Design a binder for this molecule. Structure first.
Ligand SMILES: O=C(O)/C(O)=C/C(=O)[C@]1(Cc2ccc(Cl)cc2)CCCN(S(=O)(=O)Cc2ccccc2)C1
Ligand SMILES: [Mn+2]
Ligand SMILES: [Mn+2]
Length: 174
């Protein structure tokens, strides 16, 4: 059962935030179990990305109002243009917002989908469960070790799902 997998694979904080995000956005984690797993995974990557730095402000994982309050605050103190859509992080070193993508498909495919969706100051960084990444301008932002740890965690999630015969379902759900 994917729902039970998610509850054993991710730390309690992450699972809580994923459940809250789903309800805030209408969804039931008991039904949309692949989505529930994807949201946890994406949350964890965002937190790991941010912990590898206080270089980053984490925007993902906050309730909508707080997320926009933070984004507004950053825009007001940097003059960086306000994004049309909530991004995932702000990079205080490069002074740009970052959109983090996690895909079960090819990274170039998901990159295009994201870049098309969001539109040009927001830096995009895409990770696969295959150790692939693609980023705006091939600027991967983090050092090699930080990206390697993210890649390892994603691949580990995939294999833990594969252990329980849940990977194939999860992969086709995107
Ligand atoms: O696709 C991403 O890489 C990504 O960063 C997605 C997001 O930020 C989502 C996350 C989300 C998805 C589904 C659900 Cl049910 C809830 C939240 C989905 C896109 C829209 N937004 S959102 O624009 O940030 C609005 C939001 C904020 C907080 C909680 C719920 C909703 C939240
Ligand atoms: Mn997001
Ligand atoms: Mn994202």
């Amino acid at each position: 059962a994917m729902e039970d997998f998610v509850r054993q694979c991710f730390n309690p904080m992450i699972v809580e935030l994923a459940e809250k995000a789903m309800k805030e956005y209408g969804e039931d984690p008991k039904i949309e179990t692949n989505k529930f797993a994807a949201i946890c995974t994406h949350l964890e990557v965002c937190f790991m990305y941010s912990d590898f730095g206080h270089r980053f402000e984490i925007i993902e994982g906050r309730d909508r109002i707080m997320a926009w309050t933070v984004v507004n605050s950053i825009c007001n103190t940097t003059g960086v243009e306000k994004p049309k859509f909530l991004p995932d992080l702000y990079d205080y070193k490069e002074n740009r917002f970052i959109e983090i993508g996690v895909t079960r498909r090819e990274v170039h495919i998901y990159y295009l989908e994201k870049a098309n969706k969001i539109k040009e100051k927001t830096h995009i960084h895409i990770f696969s469960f295959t150790g692939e990444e693609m980023a705006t301008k091939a600027d991967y932002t983090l050092d090699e070790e930080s990206r390697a740890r993210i890649k390892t965690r994603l691949f580990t999630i995939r294999q833990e799902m594969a252990s329980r015969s849940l990977w194939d379902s999860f992969r086709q759900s995107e």
